[PDB]
Amino acid sequence: ETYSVDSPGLYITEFKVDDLSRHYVLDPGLEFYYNHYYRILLFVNKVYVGPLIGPIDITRYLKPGVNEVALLVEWGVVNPVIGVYQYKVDGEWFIQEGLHGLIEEWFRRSPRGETAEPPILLGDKAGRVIWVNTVIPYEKEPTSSSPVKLEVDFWGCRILVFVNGEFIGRISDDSPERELYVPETAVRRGLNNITLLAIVTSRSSGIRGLRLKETYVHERKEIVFKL
């Protein structure tokens, strides 16, 4: 009956598998992901798989020939697809929390780097973390009378911003604005070491420039009344 599966209810659909030798990985679609996650409960055949975390290998829950998917969506949207894979790949896994330059605090003091011109091309360096370090002069006392936004012009990167070693924020290609507010507690009178950790995400990447913009400059005037 319905194409959307996008509104509260219990939805059922039916699909067919040949041999059970493949891996059947259910993707909930880009519609599903929200900052407040969607209460959608997956069943494969009559068996409960779980709430939708994200993508799931459903191969355990399915049988040769015809199968069902049910979705009790209480709230939110999905657009489910099953990707079918020849193998799931064996290997030992290891983790690190953070990165070498991050856990050595290169945002406080990096080693020296090579100088680059303002259009920094990074798409060659894709798959890697580049630290772009800059000094910006700010020759005046920093105040909430003249707040500072750092604007980064870039593409193809996920960039973490640090000002004088204080972590300011993140910017990504799909972030809604290219500006971070940097507080008067981060900014220094004199030189500001403003540093970008760019995880370089694409063969097109680059940073085109930095600016600190004062959003406005108000006069704080002390007004005095003799009685």
Partner: protein, 738 residues
């Protein structure tokens, strides 16, 4: 009455807490809401912080856990506090408040599960011991037990409330939005789309009838909206919220009789690095009253007029009830009415983009005689009716202009009334000892008829004064201002009101001789400053420039800030140099089991992780399909992948790399993974790291779009636990029963 902004001490730098809380006090806010996020204070299953200390690379030194100093500072500023200490806070925060170690302890969050609730009792013992002195000081006036448990189980919220009622005797204890509570007060979180008054009025009318005799509040009115990556937009995701809209909702809530209002984000501020929800921006500016950088937006000044009225007329506004006895003469504005012990209010709402001209019928007579009530486009006007000015012979029979403020200065009541430029407002004053005389300054027209003075005022960019004298020697000083000078009026002391163009009035030193105030001037801020006070002002100076005085009347001084004082400026600063360093990425590696979440491995932080996977491949590559992809599937919210040191792909939860650089034997795959935050619901464990796996080929793609929708009803109510239902779902019965 509680007039709140929400201002999160965990999203504002500690130096800026006074700067932001005093902007709220200066709006007429008399209370602060805040969450107290559990994961802000216990990030890592160790000790509750409650200090300026920090131990995360992503939280700047100037963000603080020192809630005790925020509560003392709200006390210094004379603000009350609503504490929202819930184990869950929502708020577009990381895990919606939960510390990411609880996912190891409890499969069923926001419940009476002994796994979850044991750790909630430890959190409530921690935060309620911090709150107790400020609760006993009457700084903290109300405790909000968690955000938005919509689904209803009374048992859970009553156990949350019982811990509070045990540790903090006699306080207000309440829930954000649970419709099913009997003894525990419930609030509302009204976030309507612009110009949908139908939903806002019906949700208010529904809510005001609920829970007889228990406390009513809008615990979250729409002060703006948040912005996201991946699906978000510049001002907010919605995309912009009109400043006109927030003011119509405020004045509607007042007209519908809801006294207690919290604007939700009055400041918003900033998310401290990876303390943010999945896909949120580091800006939590929220398009709020105070923008993230400290700017007083149009929404600030609009909100400030309503919150100033609700302080100035608090005695009126707390005496009110429905009444529904005044009528409009024309259907061009919607009338929301209240009646009270010593006055009455008519909220005339014009949701249209046309200007409305209106008359009211009160006692079988049209009240404003020589003027219509102007109701601006996209506006609600509080017309004030029948008001007996307490302890005085004066009744303000009506005002066609909005009263901003009322104050008492010895013999004199001061009332500030406003309209737009070229608006005619009529104000009727009835004097129970008769009118002795009326003095004026500016374009005020006087009509006297028995015990009444009718005052018809043509509003302009200044103050018009009328001083109605009673025979008893009590006086009523009416001050008539344009809307923008009522917006830029500050009660900098209870005996000092500045009506001005000034952008903000800031801190004060009310000394016993030489009073001082910290004014902030933008390029609009010059022109006349009008000062209302019982103090004998001998001189006014600005930054040691002497300003000229005219004493207009016993309580009023005019002066001029010269147009040469203010400046317009918006400078930009650029790098001297750009220096590049490639990070070697790898510090040290520890082994993890395939598909295991990094929180099951003790990594309770969001942010960057690098995985190394040592994948084994062999002659089975000759059994792989022609598509020849490698897919990394089921990981938390961003990864960049490299295969045998060649960049292979990036994406959010699923990446399908072309397998170009795979080989027989051991293959190194590096996954630089960034986890943006957990989601800000508090029900689902959405794990950080790679909770799925790595897969080969693409044999096919089965699209699922032929759905049957079977109409199942989730049994929400006072007995329904959503976490029990997510763990043990009953639609298995309805799947068996077709």
């Amino acid at each position: 009455t509680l007039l709140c902004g929400e201002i999160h001490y965990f999203r504002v730098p500690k130096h800026l807490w006074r700067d932001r809380l005093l902007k709220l006090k200066r709006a007429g806010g008399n209370c602060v809401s805040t969450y107290i996020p559990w994961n802000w204070h216990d990030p890592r299953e160790k000790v509750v912080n409650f200090t300026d200390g920090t131990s995360q690379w992503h939280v700047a030194s100037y963000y603080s856990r020192d809630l005790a100093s925020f509560l003392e500072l709200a006390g210094e500023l004379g603000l009350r506090v609503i504490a929202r200490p819930g184990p869950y806070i929502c708020s577009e925060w990381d895990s919606g408040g939960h510390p990411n170690w609880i996912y190891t302890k409890a499969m069923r969050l926001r419940s009476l599960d002994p796994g979850y609730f044991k750790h909630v009792v430890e959190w409530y013992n921690s935060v309620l011991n911090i709150l107790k002195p400020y609760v006993e000081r009457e700084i903290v006036i109300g405790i909000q037990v968690e955000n938005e448990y919509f689904w209803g189980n009374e048992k859970y919220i009553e156990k949350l409330a019982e811990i509070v009622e045990e540790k903090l005797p006699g306080v207000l204890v309440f829930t954000n939005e649970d419709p099913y509570l009997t003894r525990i007060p419930n609030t509302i979180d009204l976030y309507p789309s612009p110009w949908d008054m139908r939903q806002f009025d019906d949700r208010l009318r529904s809510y005001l009838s609920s829970q007889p005799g228990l406390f009513k509040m809008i615990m979250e009115l729409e002060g703006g909206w948040f912005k996201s990556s991946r699906y978000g937009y510049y001002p907010t995701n919605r995309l912009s919220i009109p400043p006109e809209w927030t003011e119509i909702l405020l004045k509607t809530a007042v007209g519908m009789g809801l006294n207690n209002i919290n604007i939700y984000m009055f400041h918003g501020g900033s998310n401290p690095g990876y303390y943010t929800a999945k896909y949120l921006a580091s800006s939590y500016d929220f398009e709020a009253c105070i923008r993230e950088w400290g700017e007083l937006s149009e929404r600030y000044y609009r909100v400030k007029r309503v919150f100033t009225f609700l302080n100035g007329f608090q005695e009126l506004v707390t005496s009110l009830k429905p009444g529904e006895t005044v009528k409009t003469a024309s259907t061009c504005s919607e009338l929301l009415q209240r009646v009270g012990d010593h006055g009455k209010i008519a909220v005339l709402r014009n949701t249209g983009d046309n200007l409305c001209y209106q008359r009211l019928i009160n006692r079988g007579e049209i009240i404003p005689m020589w003027t219509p009530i102007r109701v601006p486009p996209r506006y609600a006007k509080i017309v004030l009716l029948d008001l007996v000015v307490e302890g005085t012979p004066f009744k303000l029979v009506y005002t066609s202009g909005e009263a901003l403020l009322m104050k008492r200065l010895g013999d004199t009541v001061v009332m500030i009334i406003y309209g737009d430029h070229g608006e005619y407002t009529e104000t009727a004053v009835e004097v129970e000892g008769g009118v002795l005389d009326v003095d004026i300054q500016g374009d005020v027209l006087i009509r006297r008829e028995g015990e009444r003075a009718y005052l018809v005022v043509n509003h302009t960019h200044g103050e018009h004064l009328a001083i109605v004298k009673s025979t008893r020697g009590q006086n009523l000083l009416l001050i008539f201002t344009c809307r923008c000078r009522a917006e830029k009026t500050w009660i900098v002391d209870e005996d000092l009101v500045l009506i001005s163009n000034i952008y903000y009035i800031g801190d004060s030193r009310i000394d016993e001789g030489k009073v001082v105030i910290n004014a902030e001037l933008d390029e609009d801020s010059c022109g006349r400053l009008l000062v209302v006070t019982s103090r004998e002002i001998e001189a006014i100076s600005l930054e040691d420039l002497d300003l000229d005085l005219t004493r207009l009347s016993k309580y009023v001084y005019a002066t001029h800030i010269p147009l040469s004082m203010c400046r317009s400026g918006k400078n930009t600063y650029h790098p001297l140099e750009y220096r590049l360093l490639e990070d070697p990425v790898f510090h040290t590696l520890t082994s993890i089991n395939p598909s295991s979440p990094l929180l099951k491995n003790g990594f309770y932080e969001n942010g960057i992780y690098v995985y190394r996977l040592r994948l084994h491949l062999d002659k089975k590559q000759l059994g792989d399909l022609l598509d020849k992809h490698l897919a990394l599937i089921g990981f938390s919210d961003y990864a960049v992948v490299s295969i045998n040191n060649e960049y292979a792909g990036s994406g959010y939860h699923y990446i399908e790399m072309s397998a170009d650089s795979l080989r027989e034997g051991v293959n190194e795959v590096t996954v630089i993974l960034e986890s943006t935050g957990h989601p800000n619901d508090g029900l689902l464990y959405v794990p950080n790291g790679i909770y799925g796996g790595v897969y080969l080929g693409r044999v096919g793609e089965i699209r699922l779009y032929k759905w049957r929708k079977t109409g199942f009803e989730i049994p929400y109510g006072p007995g329904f636990d959503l976490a029990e239902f997510i763990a043990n779902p009953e639609p298995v019965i309805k799947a068996l029963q077709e």
